[PDB]
C-alpha cells in the first residue's frame with residue numbers, strides 16, 4: 001500500500017533499515033496557530049469530559065463507532081468512568097480531547113486524544129504524548145477526516161512543546177517499533193463458545209472444556225490483597241525498577257502510579273503481595289473493558305479483563321498470573337486477555353492462554369530507532 005498521508009509524516013518508511021536513534025525532524029520553533037481546515041459543515045470542539053453530557057456524547061460515539069473485530073460480532077464498550085480514567089491522568093489538557101462536530105446539529109462525529117507521558121526508549125527518556133481513541137463516525141468514513149484529526153492533535157501537542165508521540169494500532173503503518181500479539185485465557189468457556197469468541201475443538205466435549213479451564217476458587221499466593229493508599233510508594237518503586245529491563249516503557253511519577261493502579265471498581269484492579277515481614281514484594285493488575293456482542297439472542301456483553309502491569313520480585317510470575325486469573329474469574333469476567341510483551345511469553349502457554357488473531361503494532365512519531373521484539377516492549381495502553 002502506498003501511504004498518501006503517512007509518507008508526508010516524520011516516521012521511518014516501511015522496510016527502511018534503522019541503525020540510528022533520534023528524531024526524524026528538528027523541534028519546530030514556530031507553530032501554526034490556526035486549526036486545520038475540516039470539510040464544509042464540520043467544526044472543532046474541545047470536549048470537557050467534566051460535563052457529564054459531553055462525556056456521554058463521547059461514550060456514545062465510541063460505543064457505536066470504535067474498534068470492532070473483522071466479522072462485526074464485537075465492539076469495545078468503554079464506560080464513561082473508564083474514559084475519565086484513560087483520558088484524565090495527571091497533566092491531561094482539555095485541548096487534547098479533540099472533537100469534531102457537525103456545524104448545524106452539533107452532533108459529535110469525530111475524536112482523537114493525547115495524554116502526556118514520560119517515555120523511556122532505549123537510552124533516551126523523552127516527554128511524549130500517547131495518542132488514543134481516534135474515531136470517525138461510520139457515516140464519515142473514507143473522506144480523509146482521520147488525517148485532519150492526526151494533524152490537528154499533532155499541532156495542539158506541538159503548541160505545548162512536545163515533538164514525539166507513542167501510539168498503537170491493529171493496522172500496519174510506517175513503521176512499527178514492535179509487534180505484539182493478543183492471547184486469551186478462557187474463564188467462562190461455555191459463554192465464549194456460545195457467542196463464537198472461541199470454538200469447541202471437534203475432539204472435546206463442553207464438560208471436558210469446562211474441566212480443562214477450571215480454576216481454583218481462591219488464590220494461592222501468601223499475603224495477596226488489594227492495593228491500598230499506603231502501597232502507592234512501594235508499587236511505584238517496584239514498577240520503576242522492574243521496567244528498566246525493557247526498551248520501551250513509561251516512566252511514571254508517584255501521582256501517575258496512584259492514577260493508573262489505585263483500584264476503581266469496574267475499571268482497574270491491583271493486588272499486591274505483602275509477605276510475612278510486612279514488605280510488598282509483588283503486584284498484579286488488570287483493567288476492565290467489556291465488548292458489546294451484536295446479534296446474539298441471549299448474551300449482550302462480553303466481560304474481558306486485560307493484563308496491565310505485573311511486577312514480580314519474590315513470587316514466581318507464573319504463580320502471580322495464576323492468581324490474576326483466579327481473581328478475574330471470581331469477579332465474573334468471561335475472558336482474560338494479555339499481550340506477548342514484557343515476560344508474558346514465559347506464562348501464556350503454561351496457563352492455557354490461546355493465541356488470538358489480532359496484532360498490536362507499536363509506533364513512535366518523530367523518533368527513529370531500531371525495532372525490538374515483543375519481549376522488550378514494556379508499555380500497555382488502554
Ligand SMILES: CCCCCCCCCCCCCC(=O)SCCNC(=O)CCNC(=O)[C@H](O)C(C)(C)COP(=O)(O)OP(=O)(O)OC[C@H]1O[C@@H](n2cnc3c(N)ncnc32)[C@H](O)[C@@H]1OP(=O)(O)O
Nearest residue numbers: 003004005006132133134135136141142144145146163165
Ligand atoms: C508530536 C505529536 C504527534 C501526535 C500524533 C501521532 C500520530 C497519531 C496517529 C493516530 C493513532 C491512533 C491510535 C488509535 O486510536 S488506534 C484505534 C483507531 N480507531 C479505530 O480503529 C476505530 C474504528 N475506525 C475508525 O474510526 C476509522 O476507520 C479511522 C478513524 C481509524 C480511520 O478513518 P477512515 O477509515 O475514515 O480513514 P480516512 O480516509 O479518514 O483516512 C485514511 C488514512 O488514515 C490512515 N489510518 C487508518 N487507520 C489508522 C489508525 N488506526 N491510525 C493511524 N492512521 C490510520 C490510513 O492508513 C490512511 O492514511 P494513508 O494510508 O493514506 O497514509
Ligand SMILES: Cc1nn(C)c(C)c1N(C)S(=O)(=O)c1c(Cl)cc(CCCN2CCN3CCC[C@@H]3C2)cc1Cl
Nearest residue numbers: 067068069074075076168169170291356357358381382
Ligand atoms: C472480544 C473483542 N472485542 N473486540 C472489539 C475485539 C476486536 C475482540 N476480539 C475478537 S479480541 O481477540 O479480544 C482483539 C482483537 Cl481480534 C484485536 C485487537 C486489536 C485492538 C486495537 N486496538 C487499537 C489501539 N487501542 C489502544 C490499545 C488497544 C486499543 C485497540 C484487540 C482485541 Cl481485544
Ligand SMILES: [Mg+2]
Nearest residue numbers: 140142143145
Ligand atoms: Mg473519514
